[PDB]
From Swiss-Prot:
Residues annotated to bind K(+) 2: G264, S273, L304, D306, G328, D351
UniProt comment concerning the protein's domains: The cytoplasmic gating ring domain of the closed KCNT1 channel harbors multiple K(+) and Zn(2+) sites, which stabilize the channel in the closed conformation. Under low-Na(+) conditions, the abundant cytoplasmic K(+) ions stabilize the gating ring domain in a closed conformation. The open KCNT1 structure contains at least two Na(+)-sensitive sites in the RCKs where Na(+) binding induces expansion and rotation of the gating ring that opens the inner gate.
Binding site for Na(+) 1: L161, H164, S186, N188
Name of the coding gene: KCNT1
Gene Ontology MF term list: intracellular sodium-activated potassium channel activity; metal ion binding; outward rectifier potassium channel activity
Binding site for Na(+) 2: F265
Keywords of the record: Calcium, Cell membrane, Glycoprotein, Ion channel, Ion transport, Membrane, Metal-binding, Potassium, Potassium channel, Potassium transport, Sodium, Transmembrane, Transmembrane helix, Transport, Zinc
Entry keyword Transferase: no
Tagged with keyword Membrane: yes
Binding site for K(+) 3: Y263
Name under which the protein is recorded: Potassium channel subfamily T member 1
Shown residues within the full chain: 351 to 1171 of 1201
Ranges of the Cytoplasmic topological domain: 1-540
Length: 540
């Protein structure tokens, strides 16, 4: 029962969250977790192997992936799972790639049976391991998520909390009202039922895709997403109202628990900064002006980099309408003013710098913070690495909520630790997001094969012809013709084909924020609020 994991440089982080994440599964816990690394253990991490619980469930060994001897040493053939991982923080982005993909070969070579899981930084290199079971592609998803953050707010936090397992352990703390409800719906998760019948499957065999998600909210509060035909094993998002269900067809759905167990311009502008251009941003821009998107509401976008745009970028981006070049980092008031940050709306920054660990995320925290104070009417987004530092973001001399959050997060991390990082103000605002937070996706994938593919289709990225786009709709005074969320759901999908998932809320102390995923459909709605719906009409 030996599980394999390989990495170039371990750190408390990657390990920890893996571990804490990995044994979160009741089903598969007992395994020997195998660690392969060239360099010695640090004085910190080597301390977490000595703890009474993780001692004999974690095997650590010194060695590489290339030599055949040390592969033997791990008992690969016997081993039930093989994981390769990439270091995040490094001097060279382009080299790390080589390291990984290489490892992939050697492992595949050695034992071409076992599943194979791996991370890849640059999109360009995706092409090389297409042969592997499952592959998580960093940049494409990074830029994608953050990109969709410019249509609806807090795109990020939504997805993250989806892919994180919890019991609703965190909703019972009863400090307040919102948070009570906020955390409650955290444990919320996506699940797999297809086969036979169960509490939810039979209800409608013969009616459409739509009528299913209606009366699923009535009995249980489950809301399905998409049906894989048994034919091509292609996944669909929100099949149109024309599609039908069978007795054997795939149901993907969300619930809190598994079914079995219970030059001047016009519109708002957006400004992006990054270290270097790459095949990365080509995909940043895809979702912005797509097909489904209108030519009225487009958001012309300005690119601000440190280094001059490279040649390929030019041939790559000249297709689209509406973008330009401006240069300089985010330091100078002036470098930002030339662009019209004032006229503009949302701020996008993705940066980094090549001793202590969490620290290396500093260079950005700072540049940003200033902006919080320069423009109180302004909204911004950000990317760190270490999912510890989050709350260190937008902080005020005196806040009762913002400071009193500390005690609440500790009070979670001490009972049991999965998500310590939810409650924090800016995080739930979507103003914050991080890299290794989606990394969880990979670990969890081992138990769920529909977990990765589902994601891309949500964003942008992969479209097999039947599919749908994730869109949002503000709530206003004529929608208040509707009382609540359930009364909404049933008058919503009786006109067009759209399914809701979560919601969004705001109160005062500018102002605060929320995301509630699949709330019981009894819950009310204010004036300023937002909901995440899926709309498919590319194809009739």
């Amino acid at each position: 029962k030996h599980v394999v994991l390989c990495v170039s440089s371990l750190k408390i982080d990657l390990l920890m969250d893996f571990l804490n994440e990995f044994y979160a599964h009741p089903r598969l816990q007992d395994y020997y977790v195998v660690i392969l690394c060239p360099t010695e253990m640090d004085i910190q991490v080597r301390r977490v192997l000595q703890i009474p619980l993780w001692s004999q469930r974690v095997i650590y060994l010194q060695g590489s992936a290339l030599k055949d001897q040390d592969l033997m040493r791990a008992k690969m053939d016997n081993g039930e799972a093989c994981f390769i991982l990439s270091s995040r923080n490094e001097v060279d982005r382009t080299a790390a790639d080589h390291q990984t993909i290489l490892r992939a070969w050697a492992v595949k070579d050695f034992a071409p049976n076992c599943p194979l899981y791996v991370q890849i930084l640059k999109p360009e290199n995706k092409f090389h391991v297409k042969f592997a079971d499952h592959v998580v592609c960093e940049e494409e998803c990074k830029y994608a998520m953050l990109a969709l953050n410019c249509v609806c707010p807090a795109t990020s936090t939504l997805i993250t909390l989806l892919v994180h397992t919890s019991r609703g352990q965190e909703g019972q703390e009863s400090p307040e009202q919102w948070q009570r409800m906020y955390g409650r719906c955290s444990g919320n998760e996506v699940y797999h039922i297809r086969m036979g019948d169960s509490k939810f499957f039979m209800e409608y065999e013969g009616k459409s895709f739509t009528y299913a998600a209606f009366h699923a909210h009535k009995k249980y509060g489950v809301c399905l997403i998409g049906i894989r035909r048994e034919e091509n094993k292609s996944i669909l998002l929100n099949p149109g109202p024309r599609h039908i269900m069978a007795a054997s067809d795939t149901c993907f759905y969300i619930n809190i628990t598994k079914e079995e167990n219970s030059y001047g311009f016009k519109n708002k502008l957006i400004i992006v900064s990054a270290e270097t251009a790459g095949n990365g941003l080509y995909n940043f821009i895809v979702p912005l002006r797509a097909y489904y998107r209108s030519r009225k509401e487009l958001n012309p976008i300005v690119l601000l980099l440190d280094n001059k745009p490279e040649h390929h970028f030019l041939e790559a981006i000249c297709c689209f309408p509406m973008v330009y070049y401006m240069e300089g980092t985010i330091d100078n008031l002036d470098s930002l003013l030339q662009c019209g940050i004032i006229y503009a709306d949302n701020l996008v920054v993705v940066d980094k710098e090549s001793e202590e660990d969490y620290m290396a995320d500093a260079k950005t925290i700072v540049n940003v913070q200033t902006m919080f104070r320069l423009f109180p009417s302004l909204s911004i987004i950000t990317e760190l690495t270490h999912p510890s530092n989050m709350r260190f973001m937008q902080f005020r001399a005196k806040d009762s909520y913002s400071l009193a959050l500390s005690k609440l997060e500790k009070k979670e991390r001490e009972n049991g630790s999965n998500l310590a990082f939810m409650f924090r103000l800016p995080f739930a605002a979507g103003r914050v997001f991080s890299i290794s937070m989606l990394d969880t996706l990979l670990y969890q994938s081992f138990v769920k094969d529909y977990m990765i593919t589902i994601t891309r289709l949500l964003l942008g990225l992969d479209t097999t012809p039947g599919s749908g786009y994730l869109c949002a709709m503000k709530i206003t005074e004529d929608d208040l013709w509707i009382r609540t969320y359930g009364r909404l759901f049933q008058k919503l999908c009786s006109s067009s084909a759209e399914i809701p998932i979560g919601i969004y809320r705001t109160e005062s102390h500018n102002t605060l924020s929320y995301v509630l995923i699949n709330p019981p459909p009894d819950t009310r709605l204010e004036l300023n609020d937002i909901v995440y719906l899926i709309r498919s009409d590319p194809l009739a």
